[PDB]
Each structure stands twice: as C-alpha cells, then as structure tokens.
C-alpha cells in the first residue's frame, strides 16, 4: 500500500516542479504597463423587490434579459430584468433551495438544494403552467449547483463530494464525476460547454470532461472553501472565489494560478465570482455585504457595488456583458450598470 | 404600452401570490431538530404525530410547528446551517440511553454558532427511565470522570442539565431542559410552552424593550 503514498507524493511534486518551470513570469508583472480601468462607479439601475427571504442563487438566460432567482421562500421567480416584471413564480417541492439555473434555450429551469434532488422545470409546457419535467434524484446529499449543457444534458454538483451528468429527458445519471474529498459547492461550465470546473470545500477546484469523465486538471491555490468558480470568457481561465477572502485567477493551459487577488481591508469570504464580458473586470461578491469590482489584469480593486444590507449570495454578468446582477440575503436582486 | 401592459398585470398578480404565500409561511413556527445518531429524534417526531430533510409539520393549540429534521445530511453543517436562521428555536434531543460526549460537542457548536446567537435551544433529555436503570449499575462517572457527587437519577439528571446549560456562553439566549421517558404525550405541550416563551422573548427583542 505504502508504495501508492510515495507515488502520490512524488507525482504531486512532479506537477509542482513542472509548474515551477512554467512559472517564467506572472500576470502581475507583464500587465504592469497597461492602463488602470479607472473608477468603475456603477449604479443600481433596478432593484427586484420580489422574494421575501434569503436569495441563494440567480442565473441569466442567454437572451441576457431574463434572470431566474431562487430563495429559501421556496420560490423560483423569472425576472424581466429590463422591466423587473415577474413572468413566472414557481413554488418548489422543497423550500431549501441552494442553486438555480436557466437552460440556454430559455425552455427549462433547474433547481435543487437540501432535498438532494435537482428539479427540472418546463417553462413552456403547452398547458401553460410550469410543470416539473423531471426530478433528478440520486445524489446522497444536497445538490449544490446545477448547470445545463442543453435542454437534455445537465451537470450537477452536490454535497456528497461528487458532480454528475444527467439526461434531463429520462432522468438517468448519464455520467458521474468523483474525486473531490469535500463538498462540491460550486460549478461552472465552459462557454462551449465541452468541459467544466467545480470548486469543492476540500480547498481545491477540479476540471472535468463531460464526455470522457476524466479529471485531467486540478487547482489548489486556496486554504478555504471555494464558494464560487467562474470561467474567464475565453474559456481558458477561470476565477476561484473562496471563504479565505481571496479571489484567484487560474489558467487552464498554465495549469495553476496566474494571479491571486487580495486586499487586507477585506476579511469576509467570497460568495461569488463573475467576469465582465471583456475579461478585464471580476465582480467578486463578499459576505461583507459588498461586491468589489477587481481589475482582473492589474489585480487592483477598481470599484465597489456597495448597497446590499446583507451578504450577497450570487453575482452574474449578462451574457452580452451589458449588466451585472447580484443577489443578497437582504432578499433583493440589484441590477448594476 | 401595447401588450406588455398585460405582462405588467401578470407580474403584479404573481407578486400578490408571493405576498400571500409569504404571509402564510411566516406563521409556521420553524424548529430545527438536532441530536446525535439514533438519539431519539425520530421518536419525538413520531409522538408529536404527523431524504436530505424531512419536515414534520403539525399543529398544536392553534400554533403550527414545522419541525425540520436534517439528519440525512452527511455533509458539513456550516455550508447549509445558515439556511436555518430564524428557526424560532432549536429542539435538541439528548439520548441518555447510553454514553454523549459527541452530543456535548454538537450542542457546543450549535449554540455558539454565529448564526444562532439569538436562537434558543430547547433541550429534551429523553429516555430518562433507561438512564435511571443504567445509573443503578453503571455510574455517570463512566461518562464524566470529573463528576463528583452521589450516583443517583435525581442528581445525575440535574448534572447533565447543568453541563448542557453551561455551553451557553452568550447570556443573550435561553436553554429549556425538559426530561422525557419517551412514553408520554405531554412532550408536544412542553415544546409549545418553550416556544411561546421564546416567541415572547424574540418579539420583545424586536420591540427594543428587551
């Protein structure tokens, strides 16, 4: 048995040495000459005075106008962000929701939480009402994050140290991803949806191939639970957000962190991470009731979206990059522009 | 406005549904059930009548409880305990069927959690009779070597009560210890009395008068 422990140590050290060789520079150096982004003094353009309880997730439709919001009130509400009109209010089978996803087509919504199942809702059933198209039971723990690849395929991350790919049409676990040693609290699929990364409370984020199931890369920058994860819009980098008060910009091809974001005035943990469409801004959310717009290249806090009265649970830039919406335990969704 | 004028009416209508639903849901006295494995959580849930969480809704003396049992979560509590803020009280089973230190660790974590500094821990010392039986042959010192006293039911039960009370490091909050033999129907009445006292206290907090 002990031979495998030696092999693990030596292989991890091989990865570490290979990255030490690949560490010829750092983004903080090469980007020095690039201009500051200035004072990004965004304003709250709308406040979605809907939910009556903690908002735990919100997600953007590909049309960049409809955002779905999920709350402990047991409701998934569809928001017309340009008008703050509610278009669907879906009473869940379980009040204990902790994630929410909008299918890219706009056809389905996914939901889940402590019920340990992911609920797939059909927004455009011919009967008109939003009926549950399928319930994806099979996790042995709370479903922590959900993300559609399309109307049928959906990936999930759950408290029981695993991520799983399903057929929302039939309900099977088409493929299941294992290798976390802790709760997989976060999930983000690449912009082309060919692979995804998930951040787990084992203080690491892991890269999964949806077709092969292989865990071909692993990232280990943090020393805390990685509450949030998000691909850089080019799909070759992703931001990891942790309770350790540091967002960290990893690179797929570099195989470890390019730059680590931190400032010591902040001690709260990160609850969300969200790039702006250019990849130049990182609107990370904090438990301190404020989201801080980091200059993603020069690693400088360049503005703050202060205004929530309680921790921000989620943040998301519109797929077109027009706006960034953040949701908070204050029960309000704010649209920032 | 041409027909978004009607989408506006839809939005207002389902906002009204949200309002009514929120009012209806606020009335329910949320209660979180905690305690070590097999420590009798299921037994009280059963006596009070009516996979990752099993809400046991039941109504007593005009007051609707929602007793949430979370025992199915073999996962880190800190990642979802914050969902259970504003549970009007924690209902805490202790199994004196045997020994328990795990139960003290669980209680200490729960009552000192930053999320529950305002949340009272109702604390049912259940299976009292079996405790009395084992005391007659197996002393309480097998659980607490520091226990310096006469090994008897009347003393050991109060010692256990005092131990659990002592984990409340914030004087802001109450602990309501009540013994139970797991064979009585007064249990729900006990929960009701503790919950009404907690409701009084938590209303007075909001009024700023307390």
């Amino acid at each position: 048995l002990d031979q495998l422990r030696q092999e693990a140590e030596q292989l991890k050290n091989q990865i570490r040495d290979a990255r030490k060789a690949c560490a010829d520079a750092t983004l903080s150096q090469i980007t020095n000459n690039i201009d500051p982004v200035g004072r990004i003094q965004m304003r709250t353009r709308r406040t979605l005075r809907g939910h009556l309880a903690k908002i735990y997730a919100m997600h953007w439709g590909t049309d960049s106008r409809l955002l779905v919001s999920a709350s402990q009130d047991g409701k998934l509400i569809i928001w017309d962000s340009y008008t703050t009109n509610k278009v669907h209010a879906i009473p869940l089978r379980s009040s204990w929701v902790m994630t929410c996803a909008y299918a890219p087509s706009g056809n389905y919504v996914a939901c889940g939480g402590l019920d340990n199942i992911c609920s797939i809702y059909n927004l455009k059933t011919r009967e008109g009402n939003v009926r549950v198209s399928r319930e994806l039971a099979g996790h042995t723990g709370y479903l922590s994050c959900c993300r559609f690849l399309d109307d049928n395929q959906i990936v999930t991350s759950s408290g029981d140290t695993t991520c799983a790919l399903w057929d929302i049409e039939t309900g099977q676990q088409t493929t299941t991803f294992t290798g976390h040693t802790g709760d997989v609290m976060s999930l983000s699929l690449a912009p082309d949806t060919r692979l995804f990364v998930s951040g787990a409370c084992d203080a690491s984020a892991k890269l999964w191939d949806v077709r092969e199931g292989m865990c071909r890369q692993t990232f280990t920058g943090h020393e805390s639970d990685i509450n949030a994860i998000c691909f850089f819009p080019n799909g070759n980098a992703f931001a990891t957000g942790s309770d350790d008060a540091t967002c960290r910009l990893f690179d797929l091809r570099a195989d470890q962190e390019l730059m680590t974001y931190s400032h010591d005035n902040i001690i709260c943990g990160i609850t969300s991470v969200s790039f702006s469409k250019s990849g130049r801004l990182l609107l990370a959310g904090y438990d301190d009731f404020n989201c801080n717009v980091w200059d993603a290249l020069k690693a400088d806090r360049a503005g703050v979206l202060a205004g929530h009265d309680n921790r921000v649970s989620c943040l998301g830039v519109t797929d077109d990059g027009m706006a960034v919406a953040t949701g908070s335990w204050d029960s309000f969704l704010k649209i920032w522009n | 406005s041409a027909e978004e004028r009607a989408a506006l009416e839809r939005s207002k209508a389902i906002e009204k549904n949200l309002k009514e639903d929120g009012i209806s849901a606020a009335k329910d006295v949320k209660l979180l059930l905690l305690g070590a494995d097999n420590s009798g959580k299921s037994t009280i849930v059963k006596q009070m009548k009516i996979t990752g969480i099993v809400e046991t809704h039941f109504t007593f003396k005009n007051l609707h409880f929602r007793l949430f049992d979370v025992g199915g979560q073999r996962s880190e509590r800190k990642k979802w305990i914050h969902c259970f803020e504003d549970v009007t009280a924690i209902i805490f089973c202790v199994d004196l069927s045997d020994y328990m230190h795990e139960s003290l660790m669980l209680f200490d974590s729960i009552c000192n959690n930053k999320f529950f500094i305002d949340t009272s821990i109702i604390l049912f010392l259940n299976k009292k009779d079996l405790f009395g039986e084992k005391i007659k042959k197996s002393p309480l010192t097998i659980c607490f070597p520091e226990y310096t006293g006469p090994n008897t039911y009347e003393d050991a039960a109060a010692y256990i009560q005092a131990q659990f009370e002592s984990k409340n490091r914030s004087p802001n909050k109450e602990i309501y210890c009540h013994m139970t033999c797991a064979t009585d129907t007064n249990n729900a009445q006990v929960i009701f009395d503790a919950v009404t006292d907690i409701i009084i206290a938590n209303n007075l907090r909001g009024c700023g008068l307390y």
């Epitope: 409809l66 011919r126 009967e127 008109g128 009402n129 | 041409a2 027909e3 009607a6 009416e9 839809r10």
Partner: single-chain antibody
Framework: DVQLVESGGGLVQPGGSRKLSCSAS????????MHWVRQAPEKGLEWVAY????????YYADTVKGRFTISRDDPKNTLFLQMTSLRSEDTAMYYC??????????????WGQGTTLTVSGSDIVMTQATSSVPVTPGESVSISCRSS???????????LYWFLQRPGQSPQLLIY???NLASGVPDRFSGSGSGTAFTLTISRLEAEDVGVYYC?????????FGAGTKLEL
C-alpha cells in the same frame, strides 16, 4: 391534450339575446387570458372581447361593447360571453382563443372549434391586397399585409400576427409578432416587413397549407383584423 370547446350558439330572433360559453381543459385556464373572435358567415375575422387572467382588465370593440358582457368562471374553467340586442351583423360564428402575455409568450396560440350563431374610426385599420391568390403545390406565395399606423412599438416589438383558417378548420396561429413561428408550425413559414407594410412567405407550399390567411394587429385594442388572403390551390 389542450382542449377548448365553445357552446351556446344557435338561431335567435332579431333584437334577441343569448349567452355563449367556452369550456377549457388540459391547460391552466386560470392563468391564460381569453379571447372571442367573431366571423360572419362569408367574411373575415373580427375581435369581439378579451378577458384578462384574473379578470382585472376587459376589452370590447365599438360594434360589440354596450351590448355584450363577458366573464370567466375560473373554477369550472369556462369563459362566458353574454350578448344582447343582436342585430343581423351578429350572425357570425364566434371562436374561443386563449392567450397569455410574458416576455416570449405567444398570444392566440390555441383556438376552439367555434360556436355558430344566427339571427333570423380613429383606430388602427389594416388591409390585404391578396384577396385571392392562385397557387400550386411546390410553389411559393407571399400574402401582403399593411396597416394605417406602424405596428413597430418603441420597445422594439412589432405586433403583427398571421393566422390560417384552413377550409372548415379553426384559425391556427402561424407567426406572432411578425417574425416568430408559433409552436407546431412547420419551418417553411416566415414573417417579414416593418413599419406599416408587412409580408409573410410560404415556402414550398403544400395542399395542407391551403386556406384563407388573416393578419391582425395587437398594438392596441381594438385588435383590427385584416380582410384576409384567399389562397386557393
């Protein structure tokens, strides 16, 4: 199985009164808005009344209002249209049509079978020059539709709707908001045009597409219908 069944229409005397009804099933009637669409025996459609979901807002045309009243019996899923003082112009058939409004919705998406009946000016108006059109299988045809005021609203929507009343059948929604294919419509339909002039193309026509096409504005009530296109094989 979405279902919507009108009833209550029949022969009645000049100056008489009647009550029509439409019984829904298979869909959440409570959440949909309901429409009634008149059709004289040898003429195009006319919008009669609209009953909103929750019955808060109710609309009527000038030729109907002051003599008609409507209501929804929500728990039985049956909408009621009450009509009084019927004149010969009321000899029409009356269709029952559901709608619901939200970003991306498709109003008028389902039509009833139509209840027949017999009796023994500043608003938007629309026209179609293609009153008749000889067409053939495999050909392609373009119904032409215009308006007196632009249907393109400031919010970027253009509220033009295209319906097909196949011979004997009920009107089927083909294109809503002048570009969008309603559910179940084949890929071969398309909507086009902007402002006050509109056109819908039928690519690779088939005998199953024969019938009379209607063009309706939704910009503001009353929803005036076009005279329609008698596409005949």
């Amino acid at each position: 199985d979405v279902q919507l069944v009108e009833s209550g229409g029949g022969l009645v005397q000049p100056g008489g009164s009647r009550k029509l009804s439409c019984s829904a099933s298979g869909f959440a009637f409570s959440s949909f808005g309901m429409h009634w669409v008149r059709q004289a025996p040898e003429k195009g459609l006319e919008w009669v009344a609209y009953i909103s979901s929750g019955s808060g807002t109710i609309y009527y045309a000038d030729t109907v209002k002051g003599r008609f009243t409507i209501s929804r019996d929500d728990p039985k899923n049956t909408l009621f249209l009450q009509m009084t003082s019927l004149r010969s112009e009321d000899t029409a058939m009356y269709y029952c049509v559901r709608s619901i409004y939200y970003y991306g919705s498709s109003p008028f998406d389902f039509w009833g079978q139509g209840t027949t009946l017999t009796v023994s000016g500043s608003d938007i108006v629309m026209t179609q020059a293609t009153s008749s059109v000889p067409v053939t299988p495999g050909e392609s045809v373009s119904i032409s539709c215009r308006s007196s005021k632009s249907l393109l609203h400031s919010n970027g929507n253009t509220y033009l709707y295209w319906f097909l009343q196949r011979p004997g059948q009920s009107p089927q929604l083909l294109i809503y908001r002048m570009s969008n294919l309603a559910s179940g419509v084949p890929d071969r339909f398309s909507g086009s045009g902007s402002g006050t002039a509109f056109t819908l193309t039928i690519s690779r026509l088939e005998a199953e597409d024969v019938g009379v096409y209607y063009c309706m504005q939704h910009l503001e009530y009353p929803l005036t219908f076009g005279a329609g296109t008698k596409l005949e094989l």
